[PDB]
Design an enzyme around this catalytic site. Structure first.
Site, PDB file in Angstrom:
ATOM      1  CD  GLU A 186      44.635  40.973  47.835  1.00 28.96           C
ATOM      2  OE1 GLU A 186      45.319  40.618  47.406  1.00 28.96           O
ATOM      3  OE2 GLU A 186      43.534  41.770  47.708  1.00 28.96           O
ATOM      4  CE  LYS A 198      45.487  38.257  44.582  1.00 29.78           C
ATOM      5  NZ  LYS A 198      45.267  39.973  44.604  1.00 29.78           N
ATOM      6  CB  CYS A 236      41.759  39.298  45.937  1.00 25.34           C
ATOM      7  SG  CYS A 236      41.178  40.976  45.216  1.00 25.34           S
TER       8      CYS A 236
END
Ligand SMILES: [Br-]
Ligand SMILES: [Br-]
Ligand SMILES: [Br-]
Ligand SMILES: [Br-]
Ligand SMILES: [Br-]
Ligand SMILES: [Br-]
Ligand SMILES: [Br-]
Ligand SMILES: [Br-]
Ligand SMILES: [Br-]
Ligand SMILES: [Br-]
Ligand SMILES: [Br-]
Ligand SMILES: [Mg+2]
Lengths: 261, 261
Positions: B41, B112, B145
């Site tokens: 990330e 994300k 993540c």
């Protein structure tokens, strides 16, 4: 609040034997302060059938048949609530079910949504959905054995306000005791997996009943082969508030528009 | 086919240092025979911003910005496919993104979906959903993540046909390494978690990049602290067939009418 599993060796086609065994062990969990006690999947009939006839012949109706009334007797006598796997005769059809009972009698049942392997030969797939039972002092979700494999099972229960997932199981694969902590974490619930033990017509089950915390902690785990109880104190406020830091709440952070069906 | 993570320590606000570092490690991955290489990330900007201004000032457009441009160059020269977390400028908005580039150029990007903690101060929640990129020789799903926390993320990508989930991460919680094999299993996919390492303005990342197999086996796991690459061979046939035995197929068996209701 205290929760327990009963890990026991259901003798196939021998329910009076299994009643006696389950009574002994529920009483044990009760003596240890459990208010909720969870038994294995199909604890009364056993698991590894060849024909539907042999299981159907003996399977009991819910709530009026011998398994539920026995469990009610026990719940009445011990003051515990009980979640137990049972072969459910319903008319012509059999379900792989879990009854929930409390000291006042019958509370509810859940029918295994995700049938596993040869169960498909004997049992109808569950049709009641994933239910959460409010006992007042706690809300108890129920799923059975193979349900653990689909994160959706635990998710549905947790989203419906389950504080604890009660999970009767007869595990044959080794994955569930590993996955259960993650189910508990990802939903911020407690899980109580009650596995059976034993070998039945050449099929061996895993044992390893377990209680898991919303932080993926294993609070209690049983042996691979012995009949036993395990108990764990659980903290309800931990599971009732879904915040995991000041800026994230699991349930508020879900973005369902992006989840494929 | 081999897949790899690049576990690295992004230096906050220093893309050019992070390019050089990334290039070094992607070549390492490639020499080791990786065809797919996953980076953490926000590998180019680092993570723990004091203010939105510091990241906004450096954040690159995708695909025309320097991060994608640099990755395209590397993809080409090393002959690998890269999935890498990058801060995406898109007009005035910032996304916590992943770029997918291959030897011939830019493939795609993921934004994300589930923002973690202070990311909510800098980034917009992602809006492109969970995408699976078809490299011809395999289908690569991407999530980033905290996305791991929601079982729906991996599920969506697996249901969308990922062979592998490339999972750029900067993990700060303890859970993901233990969760990722379960995510791999419940979806019968492989997962490649490319975590960063480092202590960055006081926030400590956990490393432990891992590649998980669809039998929940850890095929490669990285250190907690070190920059490194990990490579594993993946059996595409194994994940393209959702059978877990001859009577159960994970996707055939999902009973969606009962989920989240
Ligand atoms: Br008997
Ligand atoms: Br007590
Ligand atoms: Br009651
Ligand atoms: Br009922
Ligand atoms: Br309900
Ligand atoms: Br889910
Ligand atoms: Br360097
Ligand atoms: Br390409
Ligand atoms: Br794109
Ligand atoms: Br934590
Ligand atoms: Br390997
Ligand atoms: Mg279905």
């Amino acid at each position: 609040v205290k929760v327990a599993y009963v890990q026991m060796n259901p003798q196939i086609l021998e329910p009076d034997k299994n009643y006696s065994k389950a009574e002994k062990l529920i009483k044990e969990a009760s003596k240890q302060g459990a208010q909720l006690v969870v038994l294995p999947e199909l604890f009364d009939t056993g698991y590894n059938f060849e024909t539907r006839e042999e299981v159907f012949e003996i399977a009991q109706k819910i709530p009026e048949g011998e398994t539920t009334t026995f469990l009610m007797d026990v719940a009445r006598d011990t003051g515990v609530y009980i979640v137990a796997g049972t072969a459910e005769k319903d008319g012509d059809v059999l379900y792989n079910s879990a009854v929930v009972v409390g000291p006042r009698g019958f509370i509810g049942k859940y029918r295994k949504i995700h049938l596993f392997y040869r169960e498909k030969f004997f049992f109808e797939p569950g049709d009641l959905g994933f239910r959460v039972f409010d006992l007042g002092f706690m809300k108890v979700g129920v799923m059975i054995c193979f349900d653990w494999f689909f994160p959706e099972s635990a998710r549905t229960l947790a989203l419906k306000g389950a504080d604890v997932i009660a999970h009767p199981a007869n595990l044959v694969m080794p994955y569930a005791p590993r996955a259960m902590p993650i189910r508990a974490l990802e939903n911020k619930v407690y899980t109580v997996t009650a596995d059976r033990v034993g070998e039945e017509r050449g099929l061996k089950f895993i044992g390893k009943s377990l209680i898991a915390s919303p932080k993926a902690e294993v609070l209690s785990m049983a042996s691979e082969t012995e009949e036993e109880v395990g108990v764990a104190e659980i903290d309800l406020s931990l599971v009732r508030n879904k915040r995991i830091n000041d800026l994230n709440d699991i349930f508020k952070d879900r973005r369902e528009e992006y989840y494929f069906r």
